[PDB]
Symmetry: C2
Subunit: 215 residues, 2 copies
């Protein structure tokens, strides 16, 4: 990932935090020169077996995901192939009218974590079922409303052969936290103040991140 030094996450924990809150990654692998790369939006969790919860240095962590086995990307996934998992969080257009300085150019403040690693296809039906059950239970606790999957386990069994589950062993993780760090602190405060005052929670979320970087 290409990241200007002043936009890197100040601490590794920022990356795990963004992934945890936005775990529907874009999973990308190389394709042919004619077709271009493959890309699928799919849910990622850390391996409950080993990594368990989200660490602050992601190197060597084991992640898990799943896709549709009919997805052509599944057939191109091979054990040993490299994969990119791109996670995105809050973002907002920055109008130079907020700056109070001239001259200027507009920009877009945004957040992204690019995780790269090596794929291992999961072939066991039960191991595959464990992955999706771990994804379900994890997300429901974090984002849901106390839903009990007990009465659905037979349903999970029935549809699970269509699940293409896989493991990713992380080789690198990079965060892009473009949050106006290139601007003077007074300028950053005006942008942050403008964002925190809008009824859009995405703008609010961007302002919160902006106020977290050191002065």
């Amino acid at each position: 990932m290409f990241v200007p030094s002043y936009y890197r996450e100040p601490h590794g924990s920022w990356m795990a935090e963004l992934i945890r809150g936005n775990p529907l990654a874009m999973a990308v692998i190389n394709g042919s020169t004619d077709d271009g790369p493959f890309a699928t939006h799919l849910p990622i969790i850390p391996d409950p077996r080993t990594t368990g919860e989200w660490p602050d240095d992601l190197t060597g962590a084991n992640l898990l995901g799943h896709m549709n086995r009919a997805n052509p990307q599944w057939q191109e996934l091979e054990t040993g192939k490299v994969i990119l998992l791109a996670f995105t969080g809050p973002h907002a257009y920055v109008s130079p009218a907020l700056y109070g300085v001239t001259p200027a150019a507009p920009t877009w403040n945004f957040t992204s974590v690019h995780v790269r690693g090596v794929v291992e296809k999961i072939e066991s039906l039960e191991e595959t079922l464990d992955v999706v059950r771990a994804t379900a239970g994890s997300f429901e606790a974090r984002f849901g409303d106390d839903w009990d999957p007990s009465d659905s386990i037979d349903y999970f069994r029935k549809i699970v052969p269509g699940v293409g589950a896989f493991r990713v062993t992380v080789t690198s993780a990079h965060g892009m936290f473009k949050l106006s760090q290139e601007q003077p602190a007074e300028v950053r405060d005006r942008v942050q103040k403008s964002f925190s005052g809008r009824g859009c929670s995405r703008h609010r979320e961007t302002a919160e991140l902006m106020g977290r970087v050191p002065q």
Copy 2:
């Protein structure tokens, strides 16, 4: 892009709508087998010609973007290389507690447009300036607050040598509007109603889209 039939864009204009609302794309090209694909988040606008010759499904449309020339992806951009531009819109986790049906499985409702096309690297200084000027002007008009760039054009000319601008000639565009179309109407309504009462704009936005998809 792999899209189950019931999640395809309800109408081609939905792809234009999502791109225009969320124009910071992830621009992706193949890389080495050791490195994996290149990916850069960058702003995309339609070529000004395209609005006056609009193709139904975006096929043949021309799009414009730019990145840092110091970005290693710029050296891999070659005229004629295929590229993927991924745009994402509103999304929200769907808990089966909203369904009121058993059995069920959780899912994530989300929106995405994947645009594939052929790159043309722009090298001319004036054409590069035209790209960033039109991006700034478009985005400011759509998202900004009446900022006038006239006092900053000299500034644009100073820094435009670092811009790597490019054109993409679209070869296909596909939408993924995963908005509970697989559920019965009574189920979709419960999710919409719960999402619209969240007060988070991302959830309310997802609910509004959900309600605008006709029954499949």
